[PDB]
């Protein structure tokens, strides 16, 4: 405890008062004097048709040329976005996959899912074909996302209410991050690769530290499970989209909310969120068969990225900002511009 | 096209390989095996031969069956049950001996699911002899206070079947029922002809004649 419960309650009241006293004004009251982006139309420059089942993940390469896609068909195929050609066709041990990753050096491809095993694939092998490099297995829940810190360290978000950092050299969990109550279903590493956040199913996103291994911040402003998350390119802000048909923007130093991207016409949830190079545009995937274009400073719909025949599962933006890719459930990977 | 012609040839070759793999894998039948804990899942999956998902596949009467016992996933169902669409049918196992409201709630939640609105559910009832002996020892109204009727084995079993079959609301999906006593080896034929019936129904629905 009763004393411990009261201590926790007064600590919550204290942190709430601290974050409330520093909120002089909202973002919408300070960006009023900027010119809106207007109608931002985009056209399907390329339509890549390679798969036969639902596509869940599609990550751009570091060179902004190769895109790797994942699907229930058990194939993780890397594609040449420029000329639509197929360069690899990697069969997977478990056909149930939910995420994929591309190494910053381009030598490694990761993919995991319900199998509870994060598989690491070696691309540039002297023997020709692609062979498995390691089978990381230390999670009791389904892996939901994977990101490569470098050629050795990889951070994975699992479905058993924790996130762990791996070492591909030995396959052992160097550091584990615990504290979430709901299922963690999203992950995004910082541009400086020194910290990251994880989106859980308890409507709470927590900042993390890869080196120290201790949680730094927590954010409680959602109503349902958080489905996607992505950092602002500046590295000091991030936006998370949930199943409550809205995506909100947070700030690391402010430890509060900035904007809520809610429209009365939209009722379906969020499946993917991604920014642009300048960070002005926030391309968000929706379960309403379309991907609304969200301005990050005025909270208005610049345009609709419609054209898919099923719900989109992943949206990614190239490192040079010249294209955006959307992966849907109709086995089509349309690359827009 | 100086050197990229060989790249085009490689792309076409692997596209042909993908087409062949898709054609080969389109012949399989996907059956999801759900239910409560220790309710005969292990004995039924071992009946037809052969850490998160335990996929068991076997061939019966020129038909390739695939079972995915996903009950071992200690997480929220709603976050990964959406990937189990396009299955021919859902196999549900109920342990009548041990009680009971959890199984009924799970069946209600799975039969009215948005993704499984059209997929049929095959209901399996196990431990017939134990349930009969328990009737011979105890009344069947312990977990059914609203029940009012004779304590006969057949009548009680029919009542339980009615409670399961009164949870559906979609005319398109039909629930198939069966009795098992953990000593019958003919349960494969029920799965087989249920799968054939569901195949016929889906084929008629696709062609527009249904």
């Amino acid at each position, epitope marked *: 405890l009763d004393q411990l419960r009261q201590e926790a309650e007064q600590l919550k009241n204290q942190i709430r008062d601290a974050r409330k006293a520093c909120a002089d004004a909202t973002l919408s009251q300070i960006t009023n004097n900027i010119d809106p982006v207007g109608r931002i139309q985009m056209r399907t420059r390329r339509t890549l048709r390679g798969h036969l089942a639902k596509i869940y993940a599609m990550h751009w390469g570091t060179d902004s040329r190769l895109l790797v896609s994942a699907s229930q068909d058990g194939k993780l195929i890397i594609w*040449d976005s420029y000329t639509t050609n197929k*360069v690899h066709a990697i069969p997977l041990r478990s056909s149930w996959v939910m995420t994929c990753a591309y190494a910053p050096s381009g030598n490694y491809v990761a993919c995991g899912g319900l199998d509870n095993i994060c598989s690491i694939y070696n691309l540039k092998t002297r*023997e020709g074909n692609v062979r498995v490099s390691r089978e990381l297995a230390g999670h009791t829940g389904y892996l939901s996302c994977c990101r490569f810190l470098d050629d050795n360290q990889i951070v994975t978000s699992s479905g058993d209410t924790t996130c762990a950092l791996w070492d591909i050299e030995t396959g052992q969990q160097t550091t584990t991050f615990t504290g979430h109550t709901g299922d963690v279903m999203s992950l995004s590493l910082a541009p400086d690769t020194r910290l990251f956040v994880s989106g859980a199913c308890d409507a709470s996103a927590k900042l993390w530290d890869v080196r120290e291994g201790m949680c730094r911040q927590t954010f409680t402003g959602h109503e349902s499970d958080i489905n996607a998350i992505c950092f602002f390119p500046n590295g000091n802000a991030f936006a998370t989209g949930s199943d409550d048909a809205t995506c909100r923007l947070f700030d690391l130093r402010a430890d509060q909310e900035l904007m809520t991207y809610s429209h009365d016409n939209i009722i379906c949830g969020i499946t993917s969120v991604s920014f642009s190079k300048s960070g002005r545009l926030l391309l968000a995937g929706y379960d309403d068969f379309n991907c609304n274009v969200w301005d990050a400073l005025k909270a208005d719909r610049a345009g609709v990225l419609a054209g898919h025949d099923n719900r989109v599962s992943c949206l990614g933006v190239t490192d040079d900002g010249m294209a955006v890719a959307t992966g849907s459930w109709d086995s089509f990977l349309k690359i827009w511009n | 096209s100086a050197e*990229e012609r*060989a790249a085009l*040839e*490689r792309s076409k*070759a692997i596209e042909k390989n993908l087409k062949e793999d898709g054609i080969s894998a389109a012949k399989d039948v996907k059956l999801l095996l759900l239910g409560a804990d220790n309710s005969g899942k292990s004995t039924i999956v071992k009946q037809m031969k052969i850490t998160g998902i335990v996929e068991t596949h076997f061939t019966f009467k020129n038909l390739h069956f695939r079972l995915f016992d996903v009950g071992g996933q200690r997480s929220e169902r709603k976050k990964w049950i959406h990937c189990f669409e396009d299955v021919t049918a859902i196999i549900f196992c109920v342990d009548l001996s041990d009680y009971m409201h959890e199984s009924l709630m799970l069946f209600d939640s799975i039969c009215n699911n948005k993704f499984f609105i059209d997929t049929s559910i095959i209901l399996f009832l196990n431990k017939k002899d134990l349930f009969g002996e328990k009737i011979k020892k105890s009344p069947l109204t312990i977990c059914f206070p609203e029940y009012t009727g004779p304590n006969t084995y057949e009548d009680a079993a029919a009542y339980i079947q009615a409670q399961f079959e009164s949870k559906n609301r979609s005319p398109n999906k039909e629930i198939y029922c069966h009795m098992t006593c953990a000593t019958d080896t003919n349960n494969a034929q029920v799965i087989f002809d249920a799968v054939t019936d569901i195949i016929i129904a889906n084929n008629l629905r696709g062609c527009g004649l249904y």
Partner: single-chain antibody
Amino acid sequence: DVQLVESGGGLVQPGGSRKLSCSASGFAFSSFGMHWVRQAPEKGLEWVAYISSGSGTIYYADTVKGRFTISRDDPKNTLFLQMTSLRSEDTAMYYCVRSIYYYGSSPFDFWGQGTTLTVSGSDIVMTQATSSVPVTPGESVSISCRSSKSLLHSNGNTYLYWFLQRPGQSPQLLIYRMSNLASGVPDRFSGSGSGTAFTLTISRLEAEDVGVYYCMQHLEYPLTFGAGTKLELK
């Protein structure tokens, strides 16, 4: 490990026929491509034949077309070369070369040991004026290779390979596509080129870098070699 071996080499009576076999092991041969290159006992290298992945397309040189036959037995993991009507100009050092073609691949990465056989117009021509450059270790030596037609393709890739053939050994790849470096080769080697003139800049020469160099173009078949530039001690 990766390794290539060839068999079926010996003196042949003039006007006869003989089969050549390239055996491969240690890698997935069914997905790769096998080339063929001859080397005269006094002159340099020369392109012979090709078969693509899956036996799709087969090419030949002008002076060998209509008399040879290149076939692949993928399950047997061997490369074949049927050659007939032995004239006096066919005696040379015949090598077997692996190649794979996709985005970012390195064709001609591995070369075979080679076999010995003894018998008693619009093509792009490769030329290099310097055929003997004496130099002591520790200095920087640059080797040139000029082109009759520009090798810069519309997509931005210049197909001007560089190869080094140590005495008593098989040729090895140093720089492919005139700008990208090989795998495992020391970082001292470098490449450059623009349109027609290409230079293979080398820094901090050592004793193991001696030999004779060869520059290849890859814009269109046949794949014509150069005369050869020799780097020697002192």
